[PDB]
């Protein structure tokens, strides 16, 4: 058929109960994730096609970058708690990978300050149990899908996107197929 198990996607042998409809894992330390988000714009192209009543969820991972990697997971939890994901995603990617001016937790906080988040609000979120729970939630999600690498995307807790089985030629053909595959899976 057009979409095939083992080609554009694979199937989790242990489906995850109560998973987000569309779940992406990434790291701000991850060069392929920089390409995915900031060059290919995969998440944006995916959302542009999703059926309505279907939302996209994005979680950070700890396993790249040591202390700073975990700080970034905690900052992403802050972004989710404050609802400022779309304001910090680009400057966090650029601070870690382009400028490489993000080398400490304080450097992450500066990005939020500069994007208009008040300091007291950032600090209250950073230190909150609501954020500690959000960090745990991201970690648990990674365990549930038995995550092995990033970037990664899972649909309805059952299907895993397999970009290795898509076309690499035209970046845009690649991106369109990826996005088309997510849409197909969402209705499956």
**Domains plus CATH for the chain?**
1-188 (3.40.30.10)
Whether 136 and 121 have beta carbons less than 8 Å apart is answered as no
Q: Which two tokens stand for residue 10?
A: 């694979």
Q: What angle do CA 34, 89, 59 make, to 5 degrees?
A: 80
Phi then psi for residue 152, to 5 deg, are -150, 150
The residues that bridge with 132 in the sheet, in sequence order, are: none
Rounded to an integer, what distance in angstroms lies between the CA atom of residue 108 and that of residue 153? 25
Rounded to an integer, what distance in angstroms lies between the CA atom of residue 180 and that of residue 187? 11
Whether 47 and 56 have beta carbons less than 8 Å apart is answered as yes
Nearest to 30, CA basis, from 81, 65, 70: 65
Rounded to an integer, what distance in angstroms lies between the CA atom of residue 2 and that of residue 22? 21
Rounded to an integer, what distance in angstroms lies between the CA atom of residue 186 and that of residue 58? 16
Nearest to 106, CA basis, from 67, 132, 136, 135: 67
Helix, coil or strand: residue 56: strand
Q: At what angle do helices 85-93 and 66-82 cross, to 10 degrees?
A: 160
Experimental technique: X-ray
DSSP 34: H
For 127, other C-beta atoms within 10 Å of its C-beta total: 11
Q: Resolution of this entry in Å? A: 1.8
Rounded to an integer, what distance in angstroms lies between the CA atom of residue 3 and that of residue 104? 43
* Residue 126 CB contacts under 8 Å (≥ 6 apart), including other chains: 74, 75, 78, 109
Count of residues in the chain: 188
Whether 115 and 146 have beta carbons less than 8 Å apart is answered as no
Phi-psi region of 156 (alpha: psi -120 to 50; beta: other; left: phi over 0): left
Whether 58 and 85 have beta carbons less than 8 Å apart is answered as yes
Nearest to 102, CA basis, from 115, 91, 118: 91
Full DSSP string of 119-165: HHHHHHHHT-HHHHHHHHHHHHHHHHTT--SSSEEEETTTEEE-GGG
Q: How far is CA 126 from CA 82, 102, 111, in A?
A: 10, 17, 14
Rounded to an integer, what distance in angstroms lies between the CA atom of residue 103 and that of residue 92? 11
Q: Which two tokens stand for residue 154?
A: 């899972």
Q: Which two tokens stand for residue 100?
A: 């490489």
Whether 150 and 32 have beta carbons less than 8 Å apart is answered as yes
* Residue 188 CB contacts under 8 Å (≥ 6 apart), including other chains: 155, 156, 159
Phi-psi region of 161 (alpha: psi -120 to 50; beta: other; left: phi over 0): beta
């Amino acid at each position: 058929a057009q979409y095939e198990d083992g080609k554009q996607y694979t199937t989790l042998e242990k489906p995850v109960a109560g998973a987000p409809q569309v779940l992406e894992f990434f790291s701000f330390f991850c060069p392929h994730c920089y390409q995915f988000e900031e060059v290919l714009h995969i998440s944006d192209n995916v959302k542009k096609k999703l059926p309505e009543g279907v939302k996209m969820t994005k979680y950070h991972v700890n396993f790249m970058g040591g202390d700073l990697g975990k700080d970034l997971t905690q900052a992403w939890a802050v972004a989710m708690a404050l609802g400022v994901e779309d304001k910090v995603t680009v400057p966090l990617f650029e601070g870690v990978q382009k400028t490489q001016t993000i080398r400490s937790a304080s450097d992450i906080r500066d990005v939020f300050i500069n994007a208009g988040i008040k300091g007291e609000e950032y600090d209250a979120a950073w230190n909150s149990f609501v954020v500690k729970s959000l960090v745990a939630q991201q970690e648990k999600a990674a365990a549930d899908v038995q995550l092995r690498g990033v970037p990664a995307m899972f649909v309805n807790g059952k299907y895993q996107l397999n970009p290795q089985g898509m076309d690499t030629s035209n970046m845009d053909v690649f991106v369109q197929q990826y996005a088309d595959t997510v849409k197909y899976l969402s209705e499956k």
